Amino acid sequence: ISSSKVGVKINEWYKYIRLFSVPDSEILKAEVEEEIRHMKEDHDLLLYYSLMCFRHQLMLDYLEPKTPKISDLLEKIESSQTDLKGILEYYFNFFRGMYEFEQYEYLNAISFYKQAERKLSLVADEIERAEFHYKVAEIYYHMKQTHMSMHHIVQAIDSYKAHENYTVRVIQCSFVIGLNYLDMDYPEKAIPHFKNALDKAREIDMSRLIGSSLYNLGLCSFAEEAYEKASEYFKEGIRVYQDNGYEHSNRILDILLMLTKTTFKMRNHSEGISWCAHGLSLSKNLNDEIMAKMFEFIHALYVDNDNEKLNSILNYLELKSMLSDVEDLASDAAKYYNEKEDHKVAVAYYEKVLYARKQIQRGD
């Protein structure tokens, strides 16, 4: 029957996906699709194949953003979900959680991740467990669950650093670690990890990783209120993203948002509006409603003083389960209004900061 022959090739396929080896991953994708052709109707093997195709696509889109094959692969994967068991059930929940995170579906992604976490003792490969620990630490950071994100990211970075050639994941883990130290107001303890990632990103010549390193470095200077140095980090990050075929990635909007916020705080009103312009039009073109709403908040704050639109956006982001952006944006409004000596409305946004922090603290 040679059902294990397809089984071993799909596992090898997964190994090359984690190594970010597109040539090897494409070779084995073709090998599996030729073996699948002359094979009995094994529903678990076909579901295993469909899951790895979904994982293979997640790697490609990460390296080449969409100018949707993901949706068709998701439909076939969600056609047989009963009678699942063993490591295949782990792969199903874990991969679905990865997809939900890409769709800003945080509550669904957490739920999928926690189901995959229950079957972690079925994962003998330490590298595969490092993939899980990194991905669960990533979403915990975006939830500003710092202690849980640190608990998982240390387990991931140690397993990755034990092996070699997982350098891409090593850069990404350096992002998570430093960004956790940043959330704890330790920018001095975060710049080492980001400069570490920037160095190794320049070695493998990974343009978006270089830009993400510049973006995370600019977030440190922003925390230190080194707005000039922060804007320069943001500028070069937008430059490397655009100069290497990443100007259509949703993640460049994060850099545009901070650069708009930074130049506004530098009292460079004129330059700031043209930055908020480019960011909000690009958010509309990429159909990213969440990033567009964040640019609306910046425009309503520094340009319009439309506090009702500010409140509705903060309420929108809370229903989006993005309480950290609720805190960051309400903190932006509180400082600006307190600087403008409008202490009446500045109190109300300081209260919203306190509200978001308590909600973040509630956790589960």
């Binding site: 990533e138 950071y141 992002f175 960004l179 940043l182 977030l219 993640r251």
Partner: peptide, 6 residues
Amino acid sequence: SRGHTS
């Protein structure tokens, strides 16, 4: 804003 976890 959240940093890039890539």
